[PDB]
Amino acid sequence: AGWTFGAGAALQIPFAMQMAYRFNGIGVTQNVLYENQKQIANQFNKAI
Amino acid sequence: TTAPAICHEGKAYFPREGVFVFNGTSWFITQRNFFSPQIITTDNTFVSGNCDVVIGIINNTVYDPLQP
Numbered sequence A: 001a002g003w004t005f006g007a008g009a010a011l012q013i014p015f016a017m018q019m020a021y022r023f024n025g026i027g028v029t030q031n032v033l034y035e036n037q038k039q040i041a042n043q044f045n046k047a048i
Numbered sequence B: 001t002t003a004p005a006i007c008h009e010g011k012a013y014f015p016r017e018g019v020f021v022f023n024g025t026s027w028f029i030t031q032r033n034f035f036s037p038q039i040i041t042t043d044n045t046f047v048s049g050n051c052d053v054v055i056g057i058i059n060n061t062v063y064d065p066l067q068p
Protein backbone atom coordinates (compact mmCIF):
# COMPACT_ATOMS: atom_id res chain seq x y z
CA ALA A 1 0.00 0.00 0.00
CA GLY A 2 2.86 2.34 0.73
CA TRP A 3 2.35 5.74 2.38
CA THR A 4 -1.41 5.47 1.84
CA PHE A 5 -1.28 3.24 4.87
CA GLY A 6 -0.98 6.22 7.25
CA ALA A 7 -3.85 8.26 5.75
CA GLY A 8 -7.23 6.58 5.51
CA ALA A 9 -7.75 3.18 3.95
CA ALA A 10 -4.69 1.44 2.61
CA LEU A 11 -4.67 1.49 -1.18
CA GLN A 12 -2.85 -1.15 -3.13
CA ILE A 13 -0.14 0.16 -5.41
CA PRO A 14 2.42 -1.77 -7.57
CA PHE A 15 5.65 -1.71 -5.64
CA ALA A 16 7.71 -0.16 -8.39
CA MET A 17 5.13 2.55 -8.71
CA GLN A 18 5.31 3.45 -5.05
CA MET A 19 9.04 3.66 -5.48
CA ALA A 20 8.54 6.08 -8.34
CA TYR A 21 6.43 8.15 -6.02
CA ARG A 22 9.09 8.06 -3.34
CA PHE A 23 11.83 9.05 -5.85
CA ASN A 24 9.75 11.91 -7.04
CA GLY A 25 9.37 13.06 -3.46
CA ILE A 26 13.12 13.77 -3.25
CA GLY A 27 13.33 15.77 -6.49
CA VAL A 28 14.53 12.92 -8.66
CA THR A 29 12.04 12.35 -11.37
CA GLN A 30 10.33 8.98 -11.73
CA ASN A 31 12.12 8.43 -14.96
CA VAL A 32 15.17 7.48 -13.00
CA LEU A 33 13.43 4.63 -11.31
CA TYR A 34 11.85 3.20 -14.35
CA GLU A 35 14.88 3.47 -16.57
CA ASN A 36 17.25 2.14 -13.87
CA GLN A 37 14.86 -0.19 -12.06
CA LYS A 38 17.20 -3.16 -12.29
CA GLN A 39 20.09 -1.33 -10.69
CA ILE A 40 17.93 0.17 -8.02
CA ALA A 41 16.45 -3.18 -7.14
CA ASN A 42 19.90 -4.77 -7.09
CA GLN A 43 21.31 -2.12 -4.77
CA PHE A 44 18.32 -2.60 -2.46
CA ASN A 45 18.76 -6.33 -2.34
CA LYS A 46 22.49 -6.11 -1.76
CA ALA A 47 22.07 -3.59 1.02
CA ILE A 48 19.72 -5.96 2.84
CA THR B 1 -5.56 -0.65 -14.15
CA THR B 2 -2.23 1.17 -14.38
CA ALA B 3 0.87 1.73 -16.38
CA PRO B 4 4.17 3.50 -15.49
CA ALA B 5 4.42 5.00 -18.95
CA ILE B 6 2.86 5.30 -22.36
CA CYS B 7 4.69 4.30 -25.59
CA HIS B 8 3.78 6.75 -28.29
CA GLU B 9 5.61 7.04 -31.59
CA GLY B 10 8.58 5.27 -30.00
CA LYS B 11 8.86 7.57 -26.96
CA ALA B 12 8.07 6.92 -23.33
CA TYR B 13 5.65 9.36 -21.73
CA PHE B 14 5.59 9.43 -17.96
CA PRO B 15 2.82 11.11 -15.97
CA ARG B 16 3.90 14.63 -15.08
CA GLU B 17 1.95 14.52 -11.84
CA GLY B 18 -0.30 11.70 -10.76
CA VAL B 19 -0.78 8.22 -12.18
CA PHE B 20 -1.94 6.73 -15.49
CA VAL B 21 -5.11 4.73 -15.06
CA PHE B 22 -7.57 2.83 -17.15
CA ASN B 23 -11.34 3.17 -16.40
CA GLY B 24 -12.28 0.04 -18.51
CA THR B 25 -12.55 2.03 -21.75
CA SER B 26 -9.85 4.68 -21.96
CA TRP B 27 -6.57 5.75 -20.42
CA PHE B 28 -6.57 8.88 -18.29
CA ILE B 29 -4.17 10.58 -16.00
CA THR B 30 -5.35 11.38 -12.55
CA GLN B 31 -4.17 12.34 -9.11
CA ARG B 32 -3.26 9.72 -6.55
CA ASN B 33 -5.50 11.04 -3.75
CA PHE B 34 -8.71 11.75 -5.65
CA PHE B 35 -10.06 10.32 -8.82
CA SER B 36 -10.59 12.96 -11.42
CA PRO B 37 -9.51 11.70 -14.86
CA GLN B 38 -7.83 14.04 -17.26
CA ILE B 39 -7.17 13.56 -20.93
CA ILE B 40 -3.62 12.50 -21.49
CA THR B 41 -2.03 15.18 -23.57
CA THR B 42 1.51 16.39 -24.07
CA ASP B 43 0.96 18.92 -21.25
CA ASN B 44 0.29 16.25 -18.62
CA THR B 45 3.31 14.16 -19.52
CA PHE B 46 7.07 14.12 -19.29
CA VAL B 47 8.89 12.48 -22.19
CA SER B 48 12.05 10.58 -21.49
CA GLY B 49 13.79 7.83 -23.41
CA ASN B 50 12.58 5.08 -25.72
CA CYS B 51 9.95 2.30 -25.12
CA ASP B 52 12.40 -0.54 -24.59
CA VAL B 53 13.65 0.30 -21.13
CA VAL B 54 10.41 0.73 -19.12
CA ILE B 55 8.80 -2.41 -17.73
CA GLY B 56 5.06 -2.43 -18.32
CA ILE B 57 4.88 0.40 -20.85
CA ILE B 58 1.58 0.46 -22.78
CA ASN B 59 0.60 1.43 -26.40
CA ASN B 60 -1.74 4.42 -25.66
CA THR B 61 -2.08 7.68 -27.59
CA VAL B 62 -0.99 11.05 -26.24
CA TYR B 63 -3.02 14.03 -27.47
CA ASP B 64 -1.31 17.02 -29.14
CA PRO B 65 -3.18 20.38 -28.43
CA LEU B 66 -1.40 22.23 -31.21
CA GLN B 67 -3.27 20.38 -33.94
CA PRO B 68 -5.71 22.83 -35.87
Ligand SMILES: *[C@@H]1O[C@H](CO)[C@@H](O[C@@H]2O[C@H](CO)[C@@H](O)[C@H](O)[C@H]2NC(C)=O)[C@H](O)[C@H]1NC(C)=O
Pocket (backbone or CB within 6 Å): A038, A039, A040, A042, A043
Ligand atom coordinates in the same frame (compact mmCIF):
# COMPACT_ATOMS: atom_id res chain seq x y z
C1 LIG C 1 26.39 3.56 -11.04
O1 LIG C 1 27.52 2.75 -10.56
C2 LIG C 1 27.18 1.30 -10.44
C3 LIG C 1 28.40 0.63 -9.80
O2 LIG C 1 28.75 1.22 -8.55
C4 LIG C 1 26.77 0.72 -11.85
O3 LIG C 1 26.18 -0.60 -11.62
C5 LIG C 1 26.99 -1.79 -12.05
O4 LIG C 1 27.40 -1.72 -13.45
C6 LIG C 1 28.25 -2.86 -13.89
C7 LIG C 1 28.60 -2.60 -15.36
O5 LIG C 1 29.40 -1.43 -15.51
C8 LIG C 1 27.47 -4.21 -13.68
O6 LIG C 1 28.31 -5.32 -14.02
C9 LIG C 1 27.04 -4.33 -12.17
O7 LIG C 1 26.28 -5.54 -11.99
C10 LIG C 1 26.14 -3.10 -11.78
N1 LIG C 1 25.68 -3.17 -10.37
C11 LIG C 1 24.90 -2.99 -9.28
C12 LIG C 1 23.55 -2.29 -9.31
O8 LIG C 1 25.30 -3.44 -8.20
C13 LIG C 1 25.59 1.59 -12.43
O9 LIG C 1 25.28 1.14 -13.76
C14 LIG C 1 25.98 3.10 -12.51
N2 LIG C 1 24.78 3.90 -12.91
C15 LIG C 1 24.83 4.98 -13.71
C16 LIG C 1 23.57 5.73 -14.03
O10 LIG C 1 25.91 5.38 -14.18
Ligand SMILES: *[C@@H]1O[C@H](CO)[C@@H](O[C@@H]2O[C@H](CO)[C@@H](O)[C@H](O)[C@H]2NC(C)=O)[C@H](O)[C@H]1NC(C)=O
Pocket (backbone or CB within 6 Å): B023, B024, B025, B026
Ligand atom coordinates in the same frame (compact mmCIF):
# COMPACT_ATOMS: atom_id res chain seq x y z
C1 LIG D 1 -14.53 6.18 -19.06
O1 LIG D 1 -14.35 7.56 -19.55
C2 LIG D 1 -15.20 7.89 -20.74
C3 LIG D 1 -14.84 9.32 -21.20
O2 LIG D 1 -14.81 10.26 -20.12
C4 LIG D 1 -16.72 7.73 -20.38
O3 LIG D 1 -17.47 7.91 -21.61
C5 LIG D 1 -18.58 8.93 -21.58
O4 LIG D 1 -19.69 8.51 -20.74
C6 LIG D 1 -20.81 9.49 -20.65
C7 LIG D 1 -21.85 8.93 -19.68
O5 LIG D 1 -22.46 7.72 -20.14
C8 LIG D 1 -21.38 9.77 -22.09
O6 LIG D 1 -22.40 10.78 -22.03
C9 LIG D 1 -20.21 10.28 -23.01
O7 LIG D 1 -20.71 10.50 -24.34
C10 LIG D 1 -19.07 9.20 -23.06
N1 LIG D 1 -17.92 9.71 -23.86
C11 LIG D 1 -17.40 9.06 -24.92
C12 LIG D 1 -16.24 9.66 -25.66
O8 LIG D 1 -17.87 7.97 -25.31
C13 LIG D 1 -16.96 6.27 -19.85
O9 LIG D 1 -18.34 6.13 -19.46
C14 LIG D 1 -16.04 5.98 -18.61
N2 LIG D 1 -16.24 4.58 -18.15
C15 LIG D 1 -16.18 4.22 -16.86
C16 LIG D 1 -16.39 2.79 -16.47
O10 LIG D 1 -15.94 5.05 -15.97
Ligand SMILES: *[C@@H]1O[C@H](CO)[C@@H](O[C@@H]2O[C@H](CO)[C@@H](O)[C@H](O)[C@H]2NC(C)=O)[C@H](O)[C@H]1NC(C)=O
Pocket (backbone or CB within 6 Å): B007, B057, B058, B059
Ligand atom coordinates in the same frame (compact mmCIF):
# COMPACT_ATOMS: atom_id res chain seq x y z
C1 LIG E 1 3.24 -1.65 -29.48
O1 LIG E 1 3.11 -1.88 -30.93
C2 LIG E 1 4.29 -2.53 -31.55
C3 LIG E 1 4.01 -2.56 -33.06
O2 LIG E 1 3.96 -1.24 -33.61
C4 LIG E 1 4.52 -3.95 -30.91
O3 LIG E 1 5.75 -4.53 -31.43
C5 LIG E 1 5.60 -5.73 -32.35
O4 LIG E 1 5.38 -6.98 -31.61
C6 LIG E 1 5.21 -8.18 -32.48
C7 LIG E 1 4.93 -9.37 -31.55
O5 LIG E 1 3.64 -9.29 -30.96
C8 LIG E 1 6.50 -8.37 -33.36
O6 LIG E 1 6.32 -9.49 -34.24
C9 LIG E 1 6.74 -7.07 -34.20
O7 LIG E 1 7.93 -7.23 -35.00
C10 LIG E 1 6.91 -5.83 -33.24
N1 LIG E 1 7.05 -4.59 -34.06
C11 LIG E 1 7.89 -3.59 -33.75
C12 LIG E 1 7.95 -2.37 -34.63
O8 LIG E 1 8.63 -3.64 -32.75
C13 LIG E 1 4.70 -3.75 -29.35
O9 LIG E 1 4.87 -5.04 -28.72
C14 LIG E 1 3.44 -3.05 -28.74
N2 LIG E 1 3.68 -2.76 -27.29
C15 LIG E 1 2.81 -3.06 -26.31
C16 LIG E 1 3.16 -2.68 -24.90
O10 LIG E 1 1.73 -3.62 -26.54
Ligand SMILES: *[C@@H]1O[C@H](CO)[C@@H](O)[C@H](O)[C@H]1NC(C)=O
Pocket (backbone or CB within 6 Å): B055, B056
Ligand atom coordinates in the same frame (compact mmCIF):
# COMPACT_ATOMS: atom_id res chain seq x y z
C1 LIG F 1 3.07 -8.41 -14.04
O1 LIG F 1 3.26 -9.86 -13.82
C2 LIG F 1 2.96 -10.69 -15.02
C3 LIG F 1 3.13 -12.16 -14.61
O2 LIG F 1 2.12 -12.57 -13.69
C4 LIG F 1 3.90 -10.27 -16.21
O3 LIG F 1 3.56 -11.02 -17.38
C5 LIG F 1 3.71 -8.74 -16.50
O4 LIG F 1 4.60 -8.32 -17.56
C6 LIG F 1 4.03 -7.91 -15.21
N1 LIG F 1 3.78 -6.46 -15.42
C7 LIG F 1 4.57 -5.49 -14.92
C8 LIG F 1 4.24 -4.04 -15.14
O5 LIG F 1 5.58 -5.77 -14.25
